[model samples]
Target: KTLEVWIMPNSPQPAEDFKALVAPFEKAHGVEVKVTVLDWGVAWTKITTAATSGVGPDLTQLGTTWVGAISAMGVLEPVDDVLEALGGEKAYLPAVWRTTRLEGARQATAVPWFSELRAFYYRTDALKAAGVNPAEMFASWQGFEAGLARLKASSFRDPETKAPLAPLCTPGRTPRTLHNAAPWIWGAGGEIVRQAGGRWQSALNSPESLEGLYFFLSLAQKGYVPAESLEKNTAQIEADFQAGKCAVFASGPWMIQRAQVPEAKGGFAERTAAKNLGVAPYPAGPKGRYTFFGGSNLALFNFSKNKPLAKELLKYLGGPEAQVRYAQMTGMLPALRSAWSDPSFQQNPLLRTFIQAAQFGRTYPSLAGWGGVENLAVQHLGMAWDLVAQGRLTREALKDLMDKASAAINQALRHH
Candidate 1:
C-alpha cells in the first residue's frame, strides 16, 4: 500500500526528519510512504478540503483541541485496534487518553503524539536575594501576586550579575494566557464554562469565577504586569521575557531551548542563564490546579485506502518505543506514560517537571463547535479583559460580558 501522510510544520522539526524516522515503518509494512509538509496557515484547510472531496492523506497530525471538531466531520478513522495493539488502554495515561474520545465515539480518532505543558520558569538566585522562597511563594493566586510584588520591588539582582527580579511573562493569547489567567478562577474554585443540559454554559460570571478574573485584573491595574501585556501578541511577550525585562516566564518544555539562543543579544542570554532557573507548577488556586495541555495527534482520515493498515501505523506511532523516541528527539513529553520509563527520559533532569505537569494538566473541552465559539469569544473576551485590566471596566462588567458570550456560544451550538 502507498501511504501518504500530511503534517503541519512546527519549526525545528522539518518534514524530512519525520519522514526519515518513519521510513523503517514503511519498509517493514511493505508500504510506500509519501510526506507532504504544509505551513501552519494552509495545513488545516488543505487537509479538510481534500478529505471532504474523498482525497486526503491516510495519516495526518492534529492537536488535542482539534480532535473533536474534525472527528465530528466523520472524516477520521477510529483506531481502536491500534490501541489494543499498543498494549491496550492500560499502557497510556488513562485520564489523558480520555481527551482523545469524542462524547459519542467508541474509538480514538487520533492517537496522542507528544505534549507541551506550561512550566513556571523562575529566577532562583534572584528569589534568594529577595529573601523569598520560591516553594513557599508558590501557592495560590494571592500568594503569586504578593511574591511577584516582592520580587519586582526587591533588589534581588543575580549576585554575580545584576538582573532584577520581576513577574513571569507569557504570551497573552493561546493556551498560555488561559493558563496564566487561571490562577484567579481556579484559586477561587471557579470555572470558565460548565456543562448544563448536555451543553456548555458560561460560568465566568459565577462568584468564584468573577473573583478569578478580577484577581488577574488587579495585576494589571496595580502595575504588576504592563497594561499593554494584553494588547501585545506572543512574539512580543517572548521578546520581553528574553530581554530579562521580566524575572519569571511561564512557558512549555521547549522554552528553555528558545531562551538559550544567542540571537537575543544584549547580555540578556547571560542574565537569564545566570539566574538559577527553576520549573514549578503554575501556582495552585483555591479551586484546584489547572494548566493547558497541547500537542499533536496521529490520526487516520476516514478516507484511508486501508483501515487495518492505518490502524497498524497509528499503533506504531503510539507504541511505547516510538512515543519515547519521538518525544526525546522532539523534546516533547509522550502521551504514553510508560514512555517515561525509558532510561533516556529518566536520566534527563528537566523531564521530571514535564512528567508532573503532563500528569496534572487539563485539556480544553473537545467539542465540535469549541474552536468556532472560542475564535469569536476570545476576541470579545479580550476586549472585556483589556477594559478590566486597564481599570476601564469593573469585575461586574467583565462578568456580564463573559456571561453574554457563553450564552451566545451555547445558542450557536444548539443551532448546529
Candidate 2:
C-alpha cells in the first residue's frame, strides 16, 4: 500500500525537487510515497481542518511554530522512537531540538526538517562609499544607527520615485512585522508571553518589552527607516533592495539566491561578484545580538493508518544523505549539526550569517495558545506600529496602545 504525505509548497524549489528526494526512500523501504503539494496560502486551513477531524495524511510538513498548537490539539503522533533511531536528540542542532517538544510534554511532537534565520543583507558598495565599516558599524545598536544616518545623508534615492532612500527596509505589516520585531523584544530580555501563576500572560506591555517596541518603532520616527516601509512586507522589502532602493534589507537566506540572477534577467547577478553584495549577522541590540528563527518540521499524524511507513520516511528525511540533498535542493539550513559541516554547506559564504543567527537566536513562545496569541499581537501591534510610523501616535498614546494589545492577548490566552 502507498503512504500519503502532504507537503506545504514553502520551498523555493519546485514540487519535483521534493519528489526526487522521496524516490530513493520509497525504493529502499518498498513503500510508495504519494506526495501532495499543498498551496501555502490555503495549506494551513486544510491541514488544521484535517488534523482536528482525524483525516490528515500519514505524514505532513509543519512550520515549527505550528507544532505546539497542533500537538496541543492531540493530533500529532509522538516521535520519541524516531528521534532515538536518528541518534538521539544530540545529533541535531540544540536550538532547533529544544523547539521540537510541546510545553509540559515529555516527548517530541515533531522532527525538525530544515530551518532559516533572519539577518541584514546589505549593499557592500553602498556602505563602503558612505565611509562605513561593516564590522564597527554593526557592533551595537548605537553604531548601527550611526551607520544608518550616514547612509541616509548620502546621495541615494529611489530610481523610480526619486524619494530619498532609507538606510534599511524593515516591514511593519502583520505577520512579518511581528517576526521582524521579535528579536528586539528578546534583545531587551522580554518575552512576548510568559508563564505566571500557572497561566500564560502577555508580556508585551512590560517595561523591557515596551523599550524594545519603542526602539523598533523609532527607526521610522527618526527618519532612518522610510515611512513607505509601513506598506511593504518582507518580500517587497527584498524586491526594493534588488532595485537599489535601500542600503540594507533584513531577511532570510533565500534573498541571496534571488539576487544571483543576471541583471538583464532582473537580479543583482553581476553585483554579487563585484563585492557589491554582502551578508552579515543582524545588528546587536542593547542587550545582545538576536534574530527571529523560522523553519519547518516533519511529523506523523495521530490519525495515520500507516505509522510504520511514516516513521521510516521520517528517518530517511533526517538522515545525513537526505539532509544534505535537501539543503542543496532548497537552500535551507539542515537541522542536523553533522550536516552543517558538510563541504557543500561550508562552501557557501552567504550562509555564514544565517548559521550565526541560528547559533544565538530565540524562537517565539511555544505555548499551546501561541498561534492565536501571535495573530492577535500581529493585528493590534501592527496597527500601533502603523500609527507610530505615520507620527500620529505619541509616546504616551503608544504606551496605551501596547497596553490594550497586551491585555487583549492575555484575554485570548485565558480561553485557550
Candidate 3:
C-alpha cells in the first residue's frame, strides 16, 4: 500500500529533494510514498477535520502543544516501540523526550522531529565599530547592557548623513518578541505557573517574573532598540534586519535560512563566504542564560490503519540523517546531538547560536493545560511590553499585571 504523508508550510522541496530522501525507505519497505504539501494556514484545519472526519493521511507533523488535546481525546497512538527500534531513549537529547509524554502514558505517544531554541544575534562588525567587545560584553547581563549602551551611543548616528542609526530591533509587539521573552522570565527564576495536582497554577506575578519584564522594558525606554520595536512583529523585525536598518536583532535557529539569504547580508549565499554572520547564544543574566525552545513533534494519528508504520516513519524522521536534512533545508536545529555534528549541518555557520541555546535552554512548562496558560501569558505580556515600551507601565504596575495574569491562569486550569 502507498504511504501518504502531509507536509505543512509547503516549500519547494516536495517534488525532488524530499522525494529523493524518502524514496529509499519506500523501496526498501515495498511501500509507495505520496507527498502532499499544504499551506500551514489550512494544514491545521485539514488535521482536525480529517481526524474527526476519518479521512486524514497516515503521518503528519504537529506542534507539541497539541499533545494534550490529542492524547486526552485518545486520538494519538503511542510510539514506544518505534523509539526502541530506533535505539530507544538514548538516541536524542534526554530532556526532549519528556515533552511528548502524556501525564498517564507509560511511553511517549509522539516523537520529537525538530527543536529550536532562542538566542541573541548581534553584528560583530557593528559592535566592534562602537568599541563594544561582545565577547566580553556578553559575559554577564550587566556587561550586555553596557555593550548595548555603547552601541546605542555610537551606532544610532548614520555614518553618511549624521542621522541616528537604530540600535536594536526587539519587535516588542510581535509574537516573536513575547515568545522570546519566556527565557528572561525564567532566567530571573520566574514561571507563568507552578505545577500542582497534575495541572499548573499561576506564578507569573512573582517579583522575579516582574523583574524580567522590567528588564525588557528598560531596553526600549533607554533607546537600546528602536521605538517602533513596539510596533513591529517578527516578520517586520526580520525584514528590517535584512535591510540592515538595525544593528542588533534577536534570533534563533528557526530563522537561519531566511537570514542566510544574500540579500539579508547573512553571507551564506554562493557568492558570500561562511562565518560572515556570528551566531551567539543569548547573553546571560544575573542568574544564567535561559531561553525558550519551540520544537514541534511527529505524531501518529489514532485513526490510521497503519499505526505501526506511522510510528516507524516518526522514528525515522528523528534519525540523524533525516534531521540533518531537515535542519539544512529549513535551518531549524535537530533535536538529536548526533545530527548537529553532521558535516552538512556543520557547514551552516549561523546555526551555532541556536545549537548552543539548545544545550542550556528552557522548554515551556509541559503541563497539559499549558496552551490555555501560554495564550494568556503571550497576550498579557504583549500588553506588559507595550506598557514598558510606551512608558505606561511602571515596575510596580508590571508586577501587579503578572500576578493577576498568573492567578487567572491557575484559576482557569482548575475548572479543566
What's each prediction's TM-score? Answer: 0.85, 0.91, 0.86
> Tens digit of lDDT per residue, candidate 1, span 279-314?
677778777777766777788877677777777778
Instruction: Please tell me which predicted candidate would have the highest lDDT against the true structure.
Output: 2
Q: State the lDDT of candidate 2 residue by residue for 1-416, as single tens digits.
A: 78888887544544677889989987777877888888755667888898878887898888878788888888888998988888887897666886687777888989888888888888787787678888877767788888998998887554444655569887766653367778878777777888878888888888888888778778887887787777877667766777667888777776665466466644456543224678887777778878888688888888888887888889999888988888777767887778888887667788876776676677776678777787788887778767867787666766787788888888888887
Clashing pairs in 1: 75-302, 168-248, 184-212, 187-285, 187-286, 189-287
| CA-RMSD of model 3 | 3.6
Error of 1 at 222 (Å): 2.0
Ten contiguous residues with the weakest lDDT in model 1: 260-269
Clashes in model 3: which pairs?
156-164, 156-165, 158-163, 205-402, 205-403
In Å, residue 300's CA in model 3 sits off its true spot by: 1.1
Candidate numbers sorted by lDDT from highest down: 2, 1, 3
Model 3 lDDT tens row, 263-366: 43433343211222456666776677787776767777777888766666776677877877776666777767677677766665567556656767776645
